[PDB]
Design a protein around this ligand. Structure first.
Ligand SMILES: *C\C=C(C)/C=C/C=C(C)/C=C/C1=C(C)CCCC1(C)C
Ligand SMILES: CCCCCCCC/C=C\CCCCCCCC(=O)O
Ligand SMILES: CCCCCCCC/C=C\CCCCCCCC(=O)O
Ligand SMILES: CCCCCCCC/C=C\CCCCCCCC(=O)O
Ligand SMILES: CCCCCCCC/C=C\CCCCCCCC(=O)O
Ligand SMILES: CCCCCCCC/C=C\CCCCCCCC(=O)O
Ligand SMILES: [Cl-]
Ligand SMILES: [Cl-]
Length: 264
């Protein structure tokens, strides 16, 4: 049902996808340890933001590790190339977590934006329904990434509609709550928004490879496209969200944040 199952892979393509995925686990899980140790320097009101990154980290990494083992389970070197065996590989598992890490990333965004109470809950609900819409329509579309390209685009189209609306909610909330943010992070939060827009656009592009490059190299380009999109939407966005939390913590009087920031 997926383009990965259509081709045999050179040893170079197979080894490179395996190393991509394994490199991914390493980063997600090495970042994991960073978000853990620095959480003590984050004020109570922001510490959930760092913790959500830990959840994102382990959510992504467990998936990535699962994909790497499934990659090696599904193919074997036969007659000079890596060929599909009795198990299959697919990316659909990667949408399911997206269902999960995105609430979390939106939520740590909203926390450092100093949203609170009912506006936090009402904003989070709308975002999660809209991010969820993007993901699930997108997921139905790549189900047809072999059998029905026309239904690829239409679902991709529907998902893309959801995408635009979420980034409208996210954008509106950043620029209206820019003013509440402490220690100069009002300048920082706008870079975050643009960082997010870059790596979140990488995924549709990845989604569309079967339509414009339906061959084994396009299978590689996806997994490459996925790796950058993830490193940036999870790991780098995490780190940036964390610097904001610590900086606002220091500006709010949290002495462990003032000391950690001063230590460097
Ligand atoms: C792991 C974290 C994040 C933020 C991943 C996000 C994924 C997307 C923004 C992908 C969206 C899609 C679009 C807009 C249209 C086709 C279907 C996709 C799911 C690939
Ligand atoms: C900031 C995002 C970081 C992404 C790091 C991804 C690592 C990949 C680096 C470049 C790969 C270039 C090597 C070419 C692959 C050879 C493909 C083949 O064997 O046919
Ligand atoms: C298993 C994969 C092989 C590579 C091993 C993992 C290497 C991890 C590489 C560097 C991690 C960089 C992520 C940032 C760590 C937090 C500290 C910081 O940069 O602020
Ligand atoms: C692998 C790592 C084992 C150590 C776990 C990290 C120690 C956290 C220190 C702390 O903040 O309490
Ligand atoms: C929420 C879902 C809203 C409507 C999505 C319907 C539009 C796409 C339908 C595609 C079905 C098909 O191609 O056969
Ligand atoms: C070339 C490599 C590009 C850099 C790789 C990713 C860099 C890490 C982002 C961490 C920066 C977050 C702190 C912001 C600094 C500040 O605003 O003062
Ligand atoms: Cl506090
Ligand atoms: Cl994830």
């Amino acid at each position: 049902k997926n383009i990965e199952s259509l081709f045999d892979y050179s040893a170079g393509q197979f080894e490179f996808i395996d190393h991509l995925l394994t490199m991914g686990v390493g980063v997600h899980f090495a970042a994991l340890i960073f978000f853990l140790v620095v959480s003590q320097f984050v004020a109570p009101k922001y510490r959930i933001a760092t913790a959500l990154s830990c959840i994102v980290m382990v959510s992504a990494g467990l998936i990535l590790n699962s994909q790497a083992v499934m990659w090696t389970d599904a193919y074997a070197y036969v007659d000079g190339s890596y060929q599909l065996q009795d198990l299959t590989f697919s990316n659909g598992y990667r949408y399911v977590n997206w269902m999960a890490t995105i609430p979390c990333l939106l939520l740590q965004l909203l926390i450092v934006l100093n949203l609170k109470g009912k506006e936090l809950f009402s904003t989070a609900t709308w975002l999660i329904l809209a991010a969820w819409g993007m993901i699930i329509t997108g997921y139905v579309g790549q189900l047809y990434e072999v059998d029905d390209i026309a239904q690829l685009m239409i679902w991709g189209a529907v998902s893309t509609a959801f995408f635009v609306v979420m980034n409208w909610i996210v954008g509106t909330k950043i620029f209206k709550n820019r003013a509440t943010m402490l220690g100069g992070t009002d300048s920082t939060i706008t870079k975050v928004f643009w960082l997010m827009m870059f790596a979140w656009t990488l995924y549709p592009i990845a989604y569309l490879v079967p339509a414009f490059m339906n061959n084994a190299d396009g299978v590689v380009l996806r997994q490459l496209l996925f790796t950058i999109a993830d490193i940036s939407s999870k790991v780098i966005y995490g780190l940036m969200i964390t610097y904001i939390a610590i900086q606002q913590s220091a500006a709010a009087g949290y002495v462990p944040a003032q000391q950690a920031l001063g230590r460097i």
